[PDB]
């Protein structure tokens, strides 16, 4: 063969696989049949998930009665205790979560260490797991393949990085709970050993927009691609006429007019809409940088890729620095100067091309618990986009041909576009109003002034505010003619404003 084996790799791992997860899968085998299915999932971590959030409601609890004893407290006093009682429930010995059982004993644990009704609460969704990893494992019509084989399977090819990986991969499920760094871990393995193309499960495939140019009815774009404009709203009602399960779409829409919506319908119906995709030389790596930056969320190659190798040794030695960093205990802008230039002298690392990712090494425990630009948090550099954009350069790969761009799936999708809005002094006050706490006449102001400043941002489109800032902004009495006339706006694209509307 000459081209990249038909296998389409997708990831899913920490707990069970929700509704929408499922439905947009299907999606993707109806329109490639041709190719063999693979959804890598981990039946030896399934109450990651949950763990996960067993310890953030320990967190968050933890932090209202520390806000409650010491009041004026700042948001650099907050989140320095809020990583501080992250960092102690995981690197408490007695509270192990190593394994499945080991999670089940700790879960349970902080279940009555909670609330009153927290133990059956937490007893409810682990049966809940159990259940959902049943019908995975024995119902048939499932394309489910375990990640504990990958590994197995990578181990007999490459040991030295299976290992490695594995050690990466084990790090980012206990010590941090990143189920998304493991995943940017797991796709390349599953690439790298079998071979094929991964996409993120919150993507679906590319529709035909020479279709969409012979209906005529979306032509308003002169400084701009068609995608750009209408793509996200195209994606929009194609889900919400599919209805599928579990969709966002069921309380949101699209400024999209009868005309073109019932275009897009027939078009849906019709399922000559999506493309399939295109078949890939077998030895190059591919990617896409369409919007802004190299993304590892849709790649392809066939196994045992030298890119792939190149990449992997790179994520590798970043858990290298990571390990050394953590040592060297970097606490001023000084150290953090005198450790880039250490790296750069015993990893040969020439400084600048990447003058962001040592910094970024500061965030690495922060990440998920402090509210960052995600253009700083520490998995991008570690495990995302960012490293992979950083090989592409050194390697000088898309000179070299080893590295081609090639639009896998698109990123126009609701799952990838519904799912940080609020940052420093800001989020504090939203955290604030979910512990029931009182907020003064300038803390409200900031807060009001911030909710209204993301629904501004996502101009005429459907911003997904958290339920305790809808909460928070219906508690609040008079708001000015333009705000009231913005929230009406919002309500159009959004379900969540129509109480918001009501007030008019």
């Not at 971590?45 to 004026?72: I, M, W």
């Not at 999670?103 to 609460?121: F, M, Y």
């Not at 007999?156 to 189920?179: H, P, V, W």
């Amino acid at each position: 063969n000459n081209f990249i084996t038909h296998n389409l790799h997708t990831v899913w791992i920490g707990g069970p696989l929700p509704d929408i997860t499922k439905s947009y899968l299907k999606v993707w085998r109806d329109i490639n049949p041709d190719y063999t299915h693979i959804t890598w999932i981990d039946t030896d971590n399934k109450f990651v998930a949950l763990y996960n959030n067993a310890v953030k409601e320990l967190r968050e609890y933890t932090l209202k009665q520390y806000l409650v004893g010491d009041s004026n407290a700042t948001a650099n006093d907050y989140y320095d205790q809020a990583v501080q009682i992250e960092r102690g429930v995981r690197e408490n010995v007695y509270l192990p979560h190593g394994n499945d059982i080991e999670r089940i004993k700790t879960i349970k644990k902080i279940a009555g260490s909670l609330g009153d009704n927290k133990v059956q609460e937490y007893r409810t969704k682990i049966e809940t797991i159990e259940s959902s990893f049943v019908e995975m494992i024995d119902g048939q019509q499932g394309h489910y393949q375990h990640v504990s084989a990958l590994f197995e399977q990578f181990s007999e090819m490459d040991n030295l990085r299976a290992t490695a990986l594995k050690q990466i991969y084990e790090r980012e499920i206990n010590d941090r709970g990143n189920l998304a760094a493991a995943s940017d871990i797991l796709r390349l393995v599953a690439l790298q050993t079998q071979g094929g193309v991964y996409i993120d499960t919150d993507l679906l495939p590319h529709i035909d927009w020479d279709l969409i140019e012979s209906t005529k009815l979306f032509l308003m774009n002169d400084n701009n691609s068609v995608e750009r404009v209408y793509s996200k709203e195209i994606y929009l009602e194609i889900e919400k006429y599919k209805q599928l399960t579990g969709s966002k779409t069921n309380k949101i829409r699209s400024g999209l007019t009868k005309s073109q919506i019932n275009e897009i319908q027939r078009l849906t119906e019709e399922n000559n809409l999506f493309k399939h995709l295109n078949e890939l030389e077998k030895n190059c790596f591919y990617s896409d940088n369409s919007v802004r930056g190299w993304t590892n969320a849709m790649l392809a190659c066939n196994e045992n890729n030298g890119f792939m190798n190149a990449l992997m040794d790179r994520i590798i030695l970043n858990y290298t620095i990571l390990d050394e960093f953590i040592i060297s205990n970097i606490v001023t802008d000084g150290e953090m100067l005198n450790f880039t230039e250490k790296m750069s002298a015993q990893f040969g690392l020439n400084a600048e091309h990447e003058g962001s990712f040592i910094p970024s090494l500061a965030n690495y425990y922060k990440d998920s618990i402090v509210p960052n630009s995600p253009q700083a948090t520490a998995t991008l550099f570690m495990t995302g986009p960012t490293v992979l954009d950083t090989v592409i350069r050194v390697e000088e790969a898309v000179r070299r041909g080893i590295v081609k761009k090639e639009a896998i799936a698109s990123l126009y999708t609701v799952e990838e576009t519904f799912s940080s809005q609020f940052y420093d002094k800001a989020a504090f006050y939203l955290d604030k109003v979910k512990f029931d706490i009182s907020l003064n006449s300038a803390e409200e102001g900031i807060l009001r002034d911030s909710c209204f400043d993301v629904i501004q941002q996502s101009k005429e489109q459907a911003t997904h505010l958290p339920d305790i800032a809808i909460k928070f902004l219906e508690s609040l009495n008079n708001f000015t003619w333009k705000q009231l006339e913005l929230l009406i706006k919002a309500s159009e694209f959004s379900d969540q404003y129509k109480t918001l509307a009501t007030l008019a």
